[PDB]
Amino acid sequence: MEDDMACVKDLVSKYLADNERLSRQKLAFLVQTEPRMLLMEGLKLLSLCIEIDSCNANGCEHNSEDKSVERILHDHGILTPSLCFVVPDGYKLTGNVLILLECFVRSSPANFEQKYIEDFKKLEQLKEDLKSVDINLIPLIDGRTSFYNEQIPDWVNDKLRDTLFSLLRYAQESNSLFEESEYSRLCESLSMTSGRLSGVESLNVLLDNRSSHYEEIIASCHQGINNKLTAHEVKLQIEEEYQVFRNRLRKGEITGQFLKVDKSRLLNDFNNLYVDEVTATKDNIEHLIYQFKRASPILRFLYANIGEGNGEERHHTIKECQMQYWRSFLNKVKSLRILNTRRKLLLIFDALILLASIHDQTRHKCSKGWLGSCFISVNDRLVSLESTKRDLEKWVGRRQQSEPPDKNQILISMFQKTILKATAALKDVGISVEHYKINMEVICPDSYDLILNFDVSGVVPTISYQDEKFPFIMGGVELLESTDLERLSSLSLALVNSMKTSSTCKEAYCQEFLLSGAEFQLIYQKTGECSKCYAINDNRVGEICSFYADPKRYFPAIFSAEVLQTTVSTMISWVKDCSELEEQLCNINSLTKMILVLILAHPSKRSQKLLQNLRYFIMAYVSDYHHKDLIDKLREELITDVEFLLYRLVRALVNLILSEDVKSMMTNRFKFILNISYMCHFITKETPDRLTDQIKCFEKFLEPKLEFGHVSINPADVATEEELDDMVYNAKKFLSKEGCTSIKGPDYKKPGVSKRFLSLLTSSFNNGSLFKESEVKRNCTTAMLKNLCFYSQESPQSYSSTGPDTGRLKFSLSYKEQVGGNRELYIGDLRTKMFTRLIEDYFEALSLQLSGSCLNNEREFENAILSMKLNVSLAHVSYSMDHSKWGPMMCPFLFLATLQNLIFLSKDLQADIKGRDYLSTLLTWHMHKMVEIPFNVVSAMMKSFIKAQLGTTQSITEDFFYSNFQIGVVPSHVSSILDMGQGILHNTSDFYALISERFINYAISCICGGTIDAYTSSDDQISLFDQVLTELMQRDPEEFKTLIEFHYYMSDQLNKFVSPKSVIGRFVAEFKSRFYVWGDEVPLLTKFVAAALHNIKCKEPHQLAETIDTIIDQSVANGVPVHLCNLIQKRTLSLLQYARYPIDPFLLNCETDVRDWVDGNRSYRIMRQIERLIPDACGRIRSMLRKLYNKLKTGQLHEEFTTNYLSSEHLSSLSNLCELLGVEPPSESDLEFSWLNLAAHHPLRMVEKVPTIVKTIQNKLSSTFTRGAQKLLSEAINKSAFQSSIASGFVGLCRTLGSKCVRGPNKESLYIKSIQSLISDIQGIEPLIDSHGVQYWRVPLNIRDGNEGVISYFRPLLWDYMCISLSTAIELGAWVLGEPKKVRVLEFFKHNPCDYFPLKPAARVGLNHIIHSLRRLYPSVFEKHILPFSPRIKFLDLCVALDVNCEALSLVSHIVKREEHYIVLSSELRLSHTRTHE
């Protein structure tokens, strides 16, 4: 064992770089002889090489002397106060930039993430401490997952660490210089293989230490449970229980929780729901219509009468005088950076704008841009007039007397110098100044005297902070028109735009809009994105109105003025043929329109809840039985009068619709009311306030634990007995529920489980009664190591009864937004998630072994839908139920006690025992978790206590804080037993619900003479009854009710509570929000419309099109008509056009029909759009494509096309492809058509080049653990620091498109306007626009040579058309290459809007195939990018080739879940197009 020393010493002597830092450690190692010292020196040298490579690679100076940061400052003469203990590994000072380069090496995922979090937090803290120095700090962290470096080659380093390991184990077995813990740590660190190599058996590495608590818990689980009874000895207990329950219920001690339906009583209870303020029951429609148009200033302004303009004054409002041009130019100039703008380079701008205004004024007498005595400045300001005159005279007098000259001369000199500077700086980058239509004529020879001799007259524009004297007439606009929607759209656009203004008559900001004639000004006095006061002003009469709205909630109505009208119009057409509703048809329209406008004008949470609570009422109205505590659950607190008006409107509508004397069509009215109820999705999803929601969520979390009487406050890591005995005591108490055989009788809605029913369930599962036929068949060295960079310290060594030795599991609490209420959310670390995943997937597999669940399986959902459809068809009884408080009422103790009593059959009995031990240990771990209290809530509670302690309601949580606040304690952590991890433990609860419902159905079947089917996914259940029970319902109304009450009691006995929103009935069935009726179908139109409306994000404009396309494709399959989708697409295109972005024929197709969504796919619509653009030329290519596909189907060439033509020039090759056959070639003025691509060199900027397939491959490949360690966690940390909304996203998108957002040939940035200017320079190319607007250009052939720097952006059309067409024809049938034609022969019928028809589309792939094809076809790229990391594949090769060579959009030809079944209007299919495959 000594020759190894010699050879490795020689190898390291010959393979070490000559560094003045490395030679020291090299000689210190080479001089040593003792093996232990060799170990130390080798480890030190390896660490040195790694850290020096890291320090030199990132361009920094290495800290060899190990000096602290304040030392580094003091040596450089930088004086700083005292600081904490910090040592930088790499430090650099460059100007005012400071660089720190701490680094380390880790192999385990959990260790890597923990070290990253630790040093990141430490360095952020130190950055905060050093911010006072007035010097910037930027940390840099490098964490590598391997020992490879630069100063040493790989093989010598590997053999070095290997021989080091061998000598390590030798010396450990010889001298035992190390103890067990450090020795094991060093082995696991330098092993580089023990990071992650095992699975479930990893728990076998540690020790047990399970001394006493485990035995007590396991015994308490087994105390009084009997799980050996036979099938004969459970029926008797069931019968006895039923007998005593029925007797005690009939006597009058058991209450009963169900009533029979009564429509009149239900309506009468709904009408008198808020009878304390609305002191009436009836309301005339006319008075409501009258007082609706005068409620709020917004509504008054919406329906007022403002017809300013006699017909010629408004004509000038489309002239675009010089003032606006000067304003835009000055804004664009100020967007750059010029020096010394403080009170010098700003007054000049106002002077120029004022001169331009005077010039525009005294030539044709226009009155724009003014407001009383004020004008709009460069930065959307509202500067006055006189103060500017004073500043101007002061400045000119000072500058003149600083020095014969003349005032006008000084003014024109200053103006010309500044203008020359500006125009030079502008010409510098990419743009001339002649494209702004500005002229240097407003600078008259005499201007100062003109400034000093101006005057205006008007009013003062004011703002009032709260009688209302409106300057106009209140209401004169009919509801049937579409004017209020346009006014709302314009006002909302102004309100959203009001957020763009940046920070620095006090100061006033103004935005401008105009409806039809004159223009109005929205005035505000504060920046930022927050609630603030707004006013509306006009030049004739100022201060029209003022209000207190919030900006970020007014998005869904921007350009969607023609979309909502069609929505209401098509929703009305449903209830149109009711023979007893014609006399009341305008009232319905008025009410619907008023509700929509009102909910779009004042968005609030209370209106959302009130509108959401209607579906439960409409479901109960058409059923047989319902919970007794239903009506009381439909009431909530309302505050403002707008909400009361909304409630009155809803009441009037629901009384008009579901009155008496109507018996024609119940399904249509049901669908109508449901769609009305689903309008709550139009408001928003985000929160109005943040602190109150946190307080509410914490209150909901803390409430149900203060009556069970078990809350731990700040538990210690070393658990004391005072907590363990209490845990055991409460665990015993949890299993002490009585019922039906006691003195006090049963008690409802209390957490707990009874021993009798647990025993019954376990015994019935063990002996076998719940399986179908198809189921039974299946010490200085320590500090030395601490100096190292790869010696980890964050691995567990032994577990216990309360988690690993590091500490009990910890979680953080936070809310998640949702329509209506807000959901709770628990967040854990990575090791915790890795630990929980074992239980999760074990229980998921165990449940998959059985049948009936519908959580993640996708086969059972179709069976459920089929059974529901059949049951509804046969008019049987259906029970739709949801459970209440499912999360905070379950318990891991219940799952453990259930698992500890099941007996399996020949399932690796010894491994079965070992797995049971593992699972029991993990569940015992979960039972002892801890949850963190947020910081804002405790801070606010402390502030409130201090405030209202020295100077009533006393919410119980506030009482808890006040109690544990005054004795010297501050709550930080809270632990208990009653709370199951919301969303963490999910599949186990699904399994438990499955077995529980199966046992309950078995018992109910054993009592009566019928059977039941059930379906459930962890919180929702649908039960289907047979014919016997359905007959029993209407023959003996007493046995039915008793059976239902017994089902309720049984479910309560097993810790499952039925919510008051469940329903038993025969008319409708619902599961997972999917309603079904016998002779119709129920689409949710408003839901999909509202979902599609506000669903945009700030990204590249070619992915929003994909997202909207997928959304519309998903929505069409449910019943939405097509023209609505066309209008939605038009709205999206207009939203894009507003941002000044050129529209190309590869975004959307707003001319589709039914067939384009059923049969075709994404590429078919693009092909159809291109065919619509340029006909008379696509047929010639289509004939050649037909012939080529017919030839290639038999596999004739497959190679001449693959390389010779595809991988060459485009134009000439095309011609050859025509002479390869006997078809006529394309004309010379056919290859002239071309479009414009901005991403021809690199994609656009947001905040070499290779195909996108390479991008996604290197993304999905270099991310496992080692090739994707740093980047993913870095980007996650970066994204965690961002919080945004939809409006802010649209604003950011509008901002980025117009700054640079463009890259040049080599490396540079430009502007879009510059590109369009250079394009418009050459007067030989012709643009062309279509109706909806799609720009495409015609360019000649000769003009290309001579200026090849701007023509490198264009791209021909026929080439891409052929690529996409051939690709999609390969992907689909061969009919695509036919010739389409509309059907113009069928006559016109009279259709009803409610008539549907089903359809099926006209009908694996892996990641290795594309790699192998790219290898065997394109070896060049493969050997440099993929190497460092029969009939079916024959066409896959062609697919990937077409994808690589034609990169416009054909990527989607391979990136593509897709629905199958379609339900469409039968009146639409008979007007589609036909494609013939001949």
Ligand SMILES: [Mg+2]
């Ligand atoms: Mg349900």
Ligand SMILES: [Zn+2]
């Ligand atoms: Zn004018």
